[PDB]
């Protein structure tokens, strides 16, 4: 709706941004709501912009998302693997379907969730054209291999897990390999 | 609807804000209407920005809301926990379901309401997706625990109160552990 304007003071005089553009300047990239080709193109644009500011400084992806269009999430996934920067993912609210895949795709040791979030890797019963059975299977096998790569679980374990129609507590997702840390408050030291 | 412009002080030479961004400058965050992922996105952005400006000065969170998506509402609650600042909550009009939860989660002693507000914890009847029986029960138990934690009531008390489809007066909500003060006028004396 109305996006607030904030004014920072660093600092020739003072400049003003909408709060979301201000977060982008702290190198945060928001992935809110369903992922479609339009959000894929925004997220990708932002990742590339930040990598050109600095190849080294981490990039943070806050994820609150119920999933979305498979090929658009892979465009995001692929872009975050391609840039040089480490990527901290941070799950607030929920990361279901391709949301949880993007959460899992952050840099190892850098994938976080808040304590009440819900994580699902089950896919819903999601693509731009209507596509054959064979190709739906190919897309899912692609998902299988990605989750397997980033949890270091077996394909059978991954395929078995995604068959179940359920969400995970962040603690269960950490044990599973989807994320690394669950935080209620900032850590000491 | 048009949002009016106010000009302030000021050491620069005036500035002109939309009315809501100026309330941001006094560290106030308006949580209004239904709570969805976009509202949670913008609230969390505002909390984070405020803490970044000062992890010390109180943040004031005015609530007029009938509820909303519970995962979005949890996303806000977790953010409130995580940031360091004291958070005053101020109920205006009403705070029902997820809205009353955010109200109860302000830092103790700083949770107020106006005289005629209405406060509900009962919970309709929503979700971004949908949804198994076990998951919605999991989500309620998460609300049971959070209400217990902040009202210092027991589970079986929280659960029984939630089964009752009714609203509380500000002073009845106070006796339950949701509020601390009901102000008709600014206090002291």
């Amino acid at each position: 709706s109305l996006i607030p304007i904030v004014v920072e003071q660093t600092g020739r005089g003072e400049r003003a941004y909408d709060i979301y553009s201000r977060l982008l300047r702290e190198r945060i990239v928001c992935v809110m709501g369903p992922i479609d080709d339009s959000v894929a193109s925004l997220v990708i644009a932002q990742l590339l912009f930040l990598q050109s500011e600095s190849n080294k400084k981490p990039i943070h992806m806050y994820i609150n998302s119920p999933g979305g269009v498979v090929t658009a999430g892979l465009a995001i996934y692929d872009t975050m693997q391609y840039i040089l920067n480490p990527i901290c993912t941070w799950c607030v609210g929920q990361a279901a379907s391709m949301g949880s895949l993007l959460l899992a795709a952050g840099t190892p040791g850098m994938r976080h969730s808040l304590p009440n979030s819900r994580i699902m890797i089950h896919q819903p019963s999601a693509t731009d054209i209507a596509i054959q059975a064979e190709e739906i299977m190919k897309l899912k096998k692609q998902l299988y291999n990605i989750y397997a790569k980033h949890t270091k679980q077996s394909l059978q374990v991954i395929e078995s897990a995604m068959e179940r129609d359920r969400y995970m507590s962040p603690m269960e997702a950490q044990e599973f390999g989807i994320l690394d840390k669950v935080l209620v408050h900032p850590p000491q030291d | 609807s048009l949002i009016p412009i106010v000009v302030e002080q000021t050491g620069r030479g005036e500035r002109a804000y939309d009315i809501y961004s100026r309330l941001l400058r006094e560290r106030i965050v308006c949580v209004m209407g239904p709570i969805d992922d976009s509202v949670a996105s913008l609230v969390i952005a505002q909390l984070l920005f405020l803490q970044s400006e000062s992890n010390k000065k109180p943040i004031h969170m005015y609530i007029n809301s009938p509820g909303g998506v519970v995962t979005a509402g949890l996303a806000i609650y977790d953010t409130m926990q995580y940031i360091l600042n004291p958070i005053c909550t101020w109920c205006v009009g009403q705070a029902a379901s997820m809205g009353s939860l955010l109200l109860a989660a302000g830092t103790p002693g700083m949770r107020h309401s106006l005289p005629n507000s209405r406060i509900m914890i009962h919970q309709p009847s929503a979700t971004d997706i949908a949804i198994q029986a076990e998951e919605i029960m999991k989500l309620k138990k998460q609300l049971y625990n959070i209400y217990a934690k902040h009202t210092k009531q027991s589970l079986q008390v929280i659960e029984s109160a939630m089964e009752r489809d009714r609203y509380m007066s500000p002073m009845e909500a106070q006796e339950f552990g949701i509020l601390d003060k009901v102000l008709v006028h600014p206090p002291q004396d």
Binding site: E26, R27, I28, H60, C88, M110, H112, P186, P187 | S52
Partner: peptide, 6 residues
Amino acid sequence: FTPXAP
């Protein structure tokens, strides 16, 4: 969400 991201 700092510390740690950023």
